[PDB]
Amino acid sequence: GISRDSRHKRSATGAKRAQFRKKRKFELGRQPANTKIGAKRIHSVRTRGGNKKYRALRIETGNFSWASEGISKKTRIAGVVYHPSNNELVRTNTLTKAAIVQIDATPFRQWFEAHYGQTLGKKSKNAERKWAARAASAKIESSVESQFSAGRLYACISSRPGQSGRCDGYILEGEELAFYLRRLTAKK
Template identity: 50%
Template sequence: LKWRALRLDTGNYSWGSEAVTRKTRILDVVYNASNNELVRTQTLVKSAIVQVDAAPFKQWYLTHYGVDIGRKKKAPAAKKDAAEGQEGEAATEEEKKSNHVVRKLEKRQQTRTLDAHIEEQFGSGRLLACISSRPGQCGRADGYILEGKELEFYMKKLQRKKGKGAAA
């Protein structure tokens, strides 16, 4: 059976190095190797490069490693000092964890590595991903988060594309 994808705004995206999959919103189609027209019309096809919402992955990372990624290091501390009130109480409640959970998080911290490019993307709240399913055939836009050499390649492509747009 075929299910046409007429209008999609979400999909399941896998983060390969962390072996986790989350349902997330598709924000934008940014690159397509076959045809630039597909980018202009925001068409979702297999192997299109899209920007997806980083929030579900950020939330998972926070619960799994106890680290809030994509935040500026000094900004939250300054805000907490300025506004003590209810936010201060909420922060102390959140920090209460059992010894078992603390030990588990510390053990996970030892093996934790995060690519600088991905951390930069978490800061903007958008991750680059590739669609690996065929949305026109199965009605779903599922894929994977770009990492490593593949991410660097597409980041260069997008930088070049931005350069051409500014010059024209």
């Protein structure tokens, strides 16, 4: 199959290389899953020396972390809108690492509104104790709240769905969120 040796190819000097030995199994390369979105289907590839990868094709939910909240919610993924390698992975909503998706933005709400009582956008005793204890730490950020309003949160995929079978990523923040914002609305 796909053979990731260097024994083909030219030498840096430019010379063309002969054919010493034949294709060896241990230098194989398998096809790109080209993982898609929606309805979990995951096939496991038998890799080298036992051990399995979980080639995922179609994935609707991933575990996404909020870097500045120390939490992670399993949310519903809703399409790619940017990818630094190819725009085909965006037009096709193909899920790869480093890809930028928009996620459910509703478990993060239900968590945040039940941790501050501040509620994004725009009575109990112990609960109010905890809320008063907190606050002075809930300014969020213009872009993350504005993200909340529409109900879709920019995240950046960080796991490898072809490999792991996971579609985990992180909510964007700071200069990175700024970069992808800029880069995103500019190309419309």
